[model samples]
Target chain A: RPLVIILMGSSSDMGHAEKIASELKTFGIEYAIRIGSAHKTAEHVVSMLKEYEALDRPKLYITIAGRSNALSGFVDGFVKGATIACPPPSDSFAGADIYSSLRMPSGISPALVLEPKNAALLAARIFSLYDKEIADSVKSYMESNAQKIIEDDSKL
Target chain B: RPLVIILMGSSSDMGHAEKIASELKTFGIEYAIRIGSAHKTAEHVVSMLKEYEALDRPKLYITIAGRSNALSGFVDGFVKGATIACPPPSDSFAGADIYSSLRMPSGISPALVLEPKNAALLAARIFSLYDKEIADSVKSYMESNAQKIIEDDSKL
Candidate 1:
């Protein structure tokens, strides 16, 4: 199964990006991380995409960025055979103006997951389409989560 | 015309509670602020309710509290003839798990507003049902907000 390519525009994005990485590890999904600014240098982003494209093509591209989230839009517009997930921290930004993430430029289609772990789960679900092993892993993880809720309710 | 009661369990909740107060002011709605602990004494909260109930009978009570969020459920279950709003600073608490606010004890009901301003707006909508003066104020405020969005779109 092809690995999911998880890219962040800056190191600061790690505040929420780590949650995504840890979730992926739990699902036993292989992923590669690359740090490059989508605005600072167009060449770097283009080259990074090219490198990932050469390696059997990524099944999903999870972009974690904040403020003006252009990285996800750029990758969504460029990547042909890969789905894009934008898990931005803008919801926690100064004014809590998260509407910007949803108002992407027309013609670009990227599914926006506000929470980091949800983004990872979405990527894993996409990968599970062809790989039954990852599919089983996601099913088990969801069952555990559900079981925890049930146990918590019973205690209360 | 009756006023909106702006109540916070602790000073930390003021971060978002202040925003709700500001929005209510824009609509020319009067609001009274109170500070106390909800967990320490249920009687203290019950007394707070009695005071608001005595003073003009507020049409809505806006409660801002995080971590367990007993304030919302407490106000929702006790207050009669007034709607309750729970707009906790879940973002400040670094969480979006607001299902607690949504799932209250069986007969209690408090509408959960994710943001502070939305809480104020919801309160104004409820108040408009009884007072035409407040209704007109809310109508104008909404128009101005909508105009700003339209003006921004015109630039592009």
Candidate 2:
């Protein structure tokens, strides 16, 4: 069962989501895509989370909203499921533009990962807690990461 | 020893930090104010936290910053001490303008409270963990807040 959900909203980034999806595939982590907006109205995002929360399984959200990331805020505040915000890059706004994703209302925290590659990697790390397939892939990926670092030192 | 440090930075908010100070005084929490900047250079903020970390007492920061809150981010990332971002209200930037305070790079998190009153209130709650005086004050404060709710209900 897929435990990770890649969620999208108004002012979203298809390329960023695509980046995360491909990375998840590398980890053999299955996920789904859904759309809801925090700007349109609060009720629908609430309904979307409730629908997902009712299922008897641990899950997480990679919520995407470009600016004023209230959608991720809604997701974090509304559910017990883990939330991560992967705001798309923009020349118009720097990392500060993604503050809506980082600084949430009290009692609601959604982790922020600027890069989608890391976002999907984080999804695997969390899911790896329960899923052996993900756990194995994580080790292999970690091993590769470590090997690269060690190789650099050896050449130096 | 002042356990709470009210921190200031470039694009700072003295008025907002002053509001938190007044609120903290009401709860009998001792504190101090200091100036540093994340945009100027990272070294000074790093030095500030290192100096504080050497102290044996538990401490917290009410970091005052504006848009692009790299100062709060640096504070949260560098030290083991608790951090809270009390970004000044700027309708010009909206809450999103304070994204630097809200959204931090991976592995570092600073709690954000938009209002100085609640930020100071939360400081009391965090401090209450160790000091019975602050703990008792917290109880009184909580009582006052709840009582107000009930009083309103009865009035209706």
Candidate 3:
């Protein structure tokens, strides 16, 4: 089975994560959402990750954290499964603080993407590596996206 | 005189911060770079912000953070100055983690800009609110960017 785990650093990130979840829903991908913080409860995050790691299914973890951005790196450091860091937008810093989510110390890496729909598409792409149904869905989604772009261009 | 303060959540962010710095340099805007983390060292960040606020010049703070992206929001909450967040690129999770940088709780606002060069341009735009020289520089830079886009479109 394929799974997408949407982890947010805080409950406040739900709105952002929901966008991602909605896209995954459109793709019919199995997914779940959970809340935890790297700064406030590091050990708990690790524990939760370990449980996920024990699963036998192909999995992707999408983390949402918007301030210091420690959760993505922290998860990347410990998890063996693929990790995606999809930080939620922040009006507080006018979204400028996204830098924390981009740069990581040596040996820690997480794929960074901004758009919620795109992030879900990426998850679909990854799962499509092993699942044919997902591959078709991704192809359809891409065509639709490109079609919209072409239609907009025509209007201009 | 006006100043742009480019701050990184960590020293590892200098590479990304430099892109913004280089653009500011071209505009002849004075700037300085510093490192601090909202998660690891909140008190120190507050103190540093206080010192900058005491300066007489109009200021713009550009913060770089990638994962979880808390630094931008943290700075926005404390500083009255305009803040811009420009996150560096990340390869891990395919850079899908930029969501955290885009969403924030109520009452905290920091402009989220992904491109390093554009972040610098935004800083210049803010400064141009009162500084004529910067306004001229911004105008020139925008014209150049638009010109390049036009040339590329023609080639296509």
Candidate 4:
């Protein structure tokens, strides 16, 4: 069962979306992905929201967009705590990442995660807050890293 | 054993540190806290890095600072993958979070988590990649949340 929904502002944001999804898989948490713009395709975004909001389950929304990043605050207002804005940082626009992602309007607070993996990891932690399969999977995944570090240290 | 290290640029950053430490506790992960500035206390920062680097166990570093954020890149250069930059975002400095925390020098990268809880969640996910104790704790904790959502959804 998918407990997380990853929404991209455009098809070009697939790289960032994939990174998020890949990390979520490590915790054995499945997620759904969608493409909708907060600007050009506002109706499409609203429609997508309607699809997920009606579900009677614990879920999270991660929006991937850049430039004006209207998608983040837009989706955040809709999903509240369930939303995370993960805008891809690139050289295309120098400081768009600064204004768009970090700054939000009154009453709209979407958890901001700059890194793709951390976005997924945050989603994993929230879901793990209530799901054992995810928590156990997360646990094992964490254990491996702990052990990996220990093992690496031994080599040194 | 404390596997995560939280270093603040100043005592003023304690709230972020405490928030990080508190979340780490949920994963059954203990962390060490220290106050050192990369700019003013270069020596102190260097000394702290040395001590942790010498440890024969796995650990992660999360630096809390703003305004130039010399601390984040400073620590990141010292401890690569184990470093996360979590500068407290505030109204005082408009875009310090963007420049100081997000941008890094060539080959100097620090994972950035804007929210305190997400910072801890990322570390939890990273550590969970290897520690069974932490992982198992995470597992049970996550299970409770999954079931919790199921219950909440039933009520809805």
Candidate 5:
């Protein structure tokens, strides 16, 4: 079975994580959300990754953190599996704080996704690489996404 | 004098930071680039912010980072000045990992602008709130930005 591991730096990230979960649910992909901080508890985060890495199923990790986002890089460096980062939006800085999540060190990288729904779409696309059923679901989702864009454009 | 502080998580972000610097330079806005990581050296980041905050001149902080994207939120929380997050493009994740920079906690927020040129433009807009000279420059920039769009549309 394919699995998506959704990790957040803090419980405050649940709102953004939920949006990703909703999309994943629509695709019927199995996912679990956990909270861990790369800065506050590096050892614990490592332990959590160890357990997940031991799983036999194909897996993808979606890391959610804001303000000094080390979790994505940390997980990417430690885990062999694919990782995606979806930090929640912040109005305090008027969304200007997103830069921290966009640049990474050499050899340390994770896919950067700003939109919650698109994060799930990308995950589904990745899963579709190995699963036929997921491939069909991704195709269907894409069509609807495209259809909405077209519909909006027509209205304009 | 008014200043723009350009900070990056690592030296690798210089290319993106330069883009923001270039735009600010064109407007004659004084700016400086510094390297600091929220995770690697949280104290240094805090120290840098404190020094800048104590400065009497009006200032705006532009933070660049990728992956878990903590710099933006961290800066926003501690600094009283405006902050902008401009994460560089990541081809590795096909830019799907930008979400980590977009979302923030309830009280923590930073304006999210992905394009380097636009990030500078936004900074200019904010500075323009106080400086009449920068205000004119912003007006001219917006016109040109709009003109380019119109010209491109006409070509079609």
Candidate 6:
């Protein structure tokens, strides 16, 4: 299982990030979680990116940040090999300003998936190249979810 | 002052709706609050619209619901005079799904204001036509907000 890095701007966001982590665990994928403020600690953020690049490079990087959302953009700019997945927190900050994720500065890009479960599925799908077992696990989970929805609909 | 009906699907959403109510109160606008399920009580919804129409004939109605929001669309279809404002709880439920508010079955139209605070401002703005005090209050609020931001930038 290759590394998937889950980066968030603050620890307060753990409530939402935990959902993504739990979903990754369900697929038997390994992930490392880190918290750093982009605006406050630019050096630490740069170091964290350099460290991730040095180690078994992350197959996927999931950024969880709300308000200004600099972390996702910053990570996208720094990481070349990684596929960026953003699952932002759902809060009042989303108000009418929810479009910030869709509209990055100019060149940087991160595929924004609003739901954590969806991000987990996306990451697993990407990692399926080497780990067929994890791929199958994610596929079955999706099928089971669809089956449950259908069964519930029949009851209605 | 004419009545404005502010309603949310659940008490948990009061935190969002309170911002709207507080804004209205500042304008000295009187309003009534009602809570009910649009999904569970279709008839009651129709009846409530008719009752409000007959009684105070509320000038603006703000419906707060999140996750498969049906209340705003339901009220918009029924009420002809009252301007329907939708301020949904922000979460994974925003974006393309917000089209649910914009695209009604056919004739119904609900003005979508994604934030609770913005919804309140719109309601007050709509009502301020008959009441000049509301107009001045809204104008002052905007100016004061801009002033604060300006002061903060100066310090920066």
Please state the Cα-based DockQ of model 1 relative to the true two-chain complex.
Answer: 0.03
Clashing pairs in 6: none
Q: Give every collision pair in model 2.
A: A99-B99, A102-B102, A102-B103, A103-B102, B69-B100
Instruction: Please state the CAPRI-style docking class of candidate 1.
Output: incorrect
- TM-score of predicted model 1? 0.52
Q: Model 5 compared with the native: what TM-score?
A: 0.54
User: Where does candidate 1 stray beyond 4 Å?
Assistant: A87-97, B1-156
DockQ of 3: 0.10
Candidate 1 per-residue C-alpha lDDT over B35-121 given as tens digits, one digit per residue, 9 for 90 to 100: 545664456568778877886655688887776677888887888865565656555424644766777777787888778888888
Ranking by DockQ: 5, 3, 4, 2, 1, 6
Instruction: Kindly indicate the candidate among 1 and 4 with the higher lDDT.
Output: 1
lDDT tens digits by residue: candidate 4, B1-156: 547899999998898789889878877787998999887999888988998877766677888996668898788656523467788767665454556676554334365667777677656655543454765665565456557778999999
Of the true interface contacts, the fraction found in model 4 is: 0.03
lDDT of 3: 0.82
lDDT of 3 by residue, A1-156 (tens): 798989998898999999999999999999989897665565577689888889898999999987657677767767776788898776654555576677665556689999888899899998998899999999998999899999999999
Question: Which ranges in model 3 have alpha carbons more than 4 Å from their true place?
Answer: A1-156, B149-156
Regions of model 5 farther than 4 Å from truth = A1-156, B147-156
Q: What is the TM-score of chain B alone in each candidate?
A: 0.87, 0.87, 0.91, 0.88, 0.91, 0.85
**Candidate with more favorable, higher DockQ: 3 or 5:** 5
lDDT of 2 by residue, B1-156 (tens): 337788878534777778889888988988887788888866877787788767776677878877667777677655544467777777764555655554454434455566677677766655543455775786676667657778999999
Q: What is the TM-score of chain A in candidate 1?
A: 0.89
**Displacement of the residue A25 alpha carbon in candidate 1, Å:** 0.9
Could you give candidate 5's per-residue lDDT for residues B107-136 as a string of tens digits?
Answer: 566899989999998988888988999999
Most accurate candidate by lDDT: 5
Winner by TM-score: 4
- Can you give the lDDT of residue B16 in candidate 3? 91
CAPRI quality level assigned to candidate 4 from its DockQ score:
incorrect
Interface root-mean-square deviation for each candidate?
13.2, 9.4, 6.6, 9.7, 6.2, 11.3
